[PDB]
C-alpha cells in the first residue's frame, strides 16, 4: 500500500496512546497546580516525564517517513509536529536542570510570601494579599511596599534561575533549526503549506509594530488623562509630564489599569458601570458566576458545561490546607476532561475572566471531535482571542442591565457612554502597550539583543519609552521584574494577549452585523444570537488544521491582523478624550523619576 498510508495509521496508532499517555500526565499534573504537596509534584514530573520519553521516542520513529511523499494536506501537516525532535534535543540529563528550574520558579509565585516589617509573622502570599492591595489600596505607601517588596523578596530568587532558564531554553530552541526560544513561540504563527496564506515568524514581530503606530495615539490621551486624574489622588508625586510610577496603575504590574476605574471614572455620579459592588449586594458566589457566564454561551448555541467539569473545576482558593496556583486556567485533559482551576472572587474582574476561561474551554470543546495532534485553535491569539469576545458584550451596561447588576438604568445617556468606555479602554488599551514591550524585551533576551548584565536595564528604560511607565525604586541587575508576573515565570508566551486584543474586535464587528445590529459595536449585545454563536461555532471546531490566516479570513472578511475595527470601538472615548485633555499634556518624559527628586 502507499507509504502515505504507513502514516495515516502511525499517526491514529499515535492519537490513541497519546491521548492517555497525555491525561496520565494532565491528571498528575492537575493534582500539583491544585496541591503543591511534593507527593504530588513527583508524580507530576512522572506522568510526563514518561510522555517526555513516549514523545521523545515516537520522533525517531516518526521521521522514518520521508517529508512530502503525503497528500490529504492535513496527513500532512499533523506529520510536522511529530517529526521535530521534541525539548530531548537537549542533553537528556541536562533538560532535567530545566524542569528543576521551570518547577521552581512555579512554586517560587505561587508560593512566596513577603512579610510585614512591623510584623515578621503577617506574611501575605501573592494571591490574596500583594494582590488585594495593588488592587485597592490608595496608600501610595501600601501600594509602594506591596509592589518592591513581592519584586524584592520573590522576584530576586527568580533572577538567578531565570537566567540559567533563557539558556538551556535557547539551546533546546535554536538545536531545533530556530534562532531563539523567541522565534519558536512566534512558531505559533507561522503558516507555511498554503499559498496567499502563509505567514512568517519573522513577520509576527513587524506586524504587530506595525499595528502598535495606530494604537499611540489612543494610547497616549489614555495614559495622558490618568496622569492627571492619578495625580489628583497623589499629589507631589507625579510629575504632569513624566509616565506614571509603576505602583498605582491598578495592579501587581500595570498590566491593566481596570482597577484605577474609581480614580478615573469621567463623570463618577452616574450608575457604577463596574458592577462589582452590585454583586455583592445580591451576594453572587463562584458557582452564580460561573453559571450565569455559562448561561452565556448556550444563549448563543454552544451547549453547557459538561457535569464533569462542574464537579472537578476548582472555582474558589481551598484557602488554608493545600495551596494551588492560583491563577485561573482551563483545563484541557483531553478523554472528555474538562475542568477550570480559579480562586474565584467577588469581584467585576472575575466575572469577566469566568467569560474568558469559559471561553477557552468551549473552545477545547469544539475541536475535540478532532484530531488530537491537531485540535489546538488556529493560534495563541484566537484562543485567547475568544473568551474576550464575550466580555466584550457580557460587560455591556445593556447586557450587565438585563442581566441583573444594573436593574431599570438611566436609559443610556450620551454620558454613560464616555463612562463604560473608559473602563474598557482601562482594561484593554491600557494593557496593549504592557503586553507589547514585555514580550519584546522578552524576545530581545532570547534573540540576544540584552546581554545579562543589562536585563533591568533595557527593562526599564522601555518601560518608560513604550509602556509610558517608571520605576519607584531603582533596581538593580540583582532583580528580575519581569519574572514576577505569572507568564514569565511559567512559561506561557505573552504576545497572544496582543494578537488575542485585534482579534477580539474583528470577530465583534463581523458577528454583531450576523445578529443584526445596528449601532456602534460598543453597543453590540449578540446575547441569543444562534446566527452569531452558530457563525463562531463552524470556526472553533476546525482546531488547527486551517492556517489562521484563511480561517480568519473566512469569518471576518481580512486575513490578518486588523487594528481599525478597534480603533473604531474607542472611537468615541478617543475624540472626547481630544477634549479632557486639552489642556493636559498628551506624552511623557524618558527621563523624568519619582526618586531621582
Ligand atoms: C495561559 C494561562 C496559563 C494563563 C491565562 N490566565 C489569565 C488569567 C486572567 C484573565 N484575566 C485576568 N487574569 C489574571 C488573574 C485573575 C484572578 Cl481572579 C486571579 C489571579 Cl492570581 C490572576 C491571564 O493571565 O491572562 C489564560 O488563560 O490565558
Ligand atoms: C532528531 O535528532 C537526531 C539527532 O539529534 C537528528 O539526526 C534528527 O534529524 C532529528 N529529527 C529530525 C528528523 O529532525
Ligand atoms: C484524508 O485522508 C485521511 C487519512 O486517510 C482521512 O482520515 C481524512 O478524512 C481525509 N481527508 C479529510 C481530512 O477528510
Ligand atoms: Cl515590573
Ligand atoms: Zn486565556
Known amino acids: 500500500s502507499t507509504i502515505e498510508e504507513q502514516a495515516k495509521t502511525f499517526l491514529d496508532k499515535f492519537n490513541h496512546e497519546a491521548e492517555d499517555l497525555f491525561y496520565q500526565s494532565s491528571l498528575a499534573s492537575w493534582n500539583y497546580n491544585t496541591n503543591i504537596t511534593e507527593e504530588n509534584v513527583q508524580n507530576m514530573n512522572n506522568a510526563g516525564d514518561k510522555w517526555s520519553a513516549f514523545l521523545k521516542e515516537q520522533s525517531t520513529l516518526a521521521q522514518m517517513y520521508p517529508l ?23 542533553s537528556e540529563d541536562k533538560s532535567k536542570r530545566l524542569n528543576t528550574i521551570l518547577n521552581t520558579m512555579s512554586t517560587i509565585y505561587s ?23 495593588m488592587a485597592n489600596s490608595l496608600d501610595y ?30 539551546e533546546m530552541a535554536r538545536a531545533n533549526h530556530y534562532e ?3 522565534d519558536y513561540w512566534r512558531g505559533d504563527y507561522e503558516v507555511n503549506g498554503v499559498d496567499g496564506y502563509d505567514y512568517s515568524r519573522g513577520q509576527l514581530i513587524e506586524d504587530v509594530e506595525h499595528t502598535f503606530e495606530e494604537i499611540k495615539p ?12 492619578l495625580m489628583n489622588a497623589y499629589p507631589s508625586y507625579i510629575s504632569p509630564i513624566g509616565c506614571l510610577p509603576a505602583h498605582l496603575l491598578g495592579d501587581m504590574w ?81 478523554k472528555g476532561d474538562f475542568r477550570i482551576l480559579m480562586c474565584t472572587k467577588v469581584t467585576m474582574d472575575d466575572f469577566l475572566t469566568a467569560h474568558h476561561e469559559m471561553g477557552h474551554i468551549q473552545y477545547d470543546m469544539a475541536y475535540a471531535a478532532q484530531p488530537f495532534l491537531l485540535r489546538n485553535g488556529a493560534n495563541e491569539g484566537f484562543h485567547e482571542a475568544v473568551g474576550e469576545i464575550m466580555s466584550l458584550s457580557a460587560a455591556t451596561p445593556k447586557h450587565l442591565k438585563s442581566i441583573g ?17 473608559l473602563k474598557q479602554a482601562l482594561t484593554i488599551v491600557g494593557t496593549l502597550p504592557f503586553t507589547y514591550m514585555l514580550e519584546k524585551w522578552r524576545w530581545m533576551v532570547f534573540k540576544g539583543e540584552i546581554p545579562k548584565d543589562q536585563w533591568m536595564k533595557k527593562w526599564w528604560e522601555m518601560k518608560r519609552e513604550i509602556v509610558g511607565v ?53 453597543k453590540c449585545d449578540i446575547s441569543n444570537s444562534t446566527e452569531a454563536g452558530q457563525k463562531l461555532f463552524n470556526m472553533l471546531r476546525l482546531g488547527k488544521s486551517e492556517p489562521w490566516t484563511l480561517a480568519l479570513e473566512n469569518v471576518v472578511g481580512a486575513k490578518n491582523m486588523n487594528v481599525r475595527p478597534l480603533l473604531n470601538y474607542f472611537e468615541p472615548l478617543f475624540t472626547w478624550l481630544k477634549d479632557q485633555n486639552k489642556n493636559s499634556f498628551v506624552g511623557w518624559s524618558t527621563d523624568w523619576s519619582p526618586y531621582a527628586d
Open 68 to 90: 512530502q511523499e503525503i497528500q490529504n494536506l492535513t496527513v500532512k501537516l499533523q506529520l510536522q509536529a511529530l517529526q521535530q525532535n521534541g525539548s530531548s534535543v537537549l
Open 111 to 133: 508560593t512566596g510570601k513577603v512579610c510585614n516589617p512591623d510584623n515578621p509573622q503577617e506574611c501575605l502570599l501573592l494571591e490574596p494579599g500583594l494582590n488585594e492591595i
Open 141 to 170: 505607601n501600601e501600594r509602594l511596599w506591596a509592589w518592591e517588596s513581592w519584586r524584592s523578596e520573590v522576584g530576586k530568587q527568580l533572577r538567578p534561575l531565570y537566567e540559567e532558564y533563557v539558556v538551556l531554553k535557547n
Open 180 to 182: 531563539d526560544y523567541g
Open 218 to 229: 489612543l494610547y497616549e490621551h489614555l495614559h495622558a488623562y490618568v496622569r492627571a486624574k
Open 254 to 334: 500595570g498590566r491593566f489599569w481596570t482597577n484605577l476605574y474609581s480614580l478615573t471614572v469621567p463623570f463618577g455620579q452616574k450608575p457604577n458601570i463596574d458592577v462589582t459592588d452590585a454583586m455583592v449586594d445580591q451576594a453572587w458566589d463562584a458557582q452564580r458566576i460561573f453559571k450565569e457566564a455559562e448561561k452565556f454561551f448556550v444563549s448563543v448555541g454552544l451547549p453547557n458545561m459538561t457535569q464533569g467539569f462542574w464537579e472537578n473545576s476548582m472555582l474558589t482558593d481551598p484557602g488554608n490546607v493545600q495551596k494551588a496556583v492560583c491563577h485561573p486556567t482551563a483545563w484541557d485533559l483531553g
Open 405 to 421: 447588576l444594573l436593574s431599570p438604568d438611566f436609559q443610556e445617556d450620551n454620558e454613560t457612554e464616555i463612562n463604560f468606555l
Open 470 to 522: 517608571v520605576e519607584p525604586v531603582p533596581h538593580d541587575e540583582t532583580y528580575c521584574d519581569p519574572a514576577s508576573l505569572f507568564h514569565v515565570s511559567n512559561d506561557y508566551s505573552f504576545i497572544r494577549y496582543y494578537t488575542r486584543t485585534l482579534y477580539q474586535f474583528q470577530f465583534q464587528e463581523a458577528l454583531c452585523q450576523a445578529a443584526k445590529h445596528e449601532g456602534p459595536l460598543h
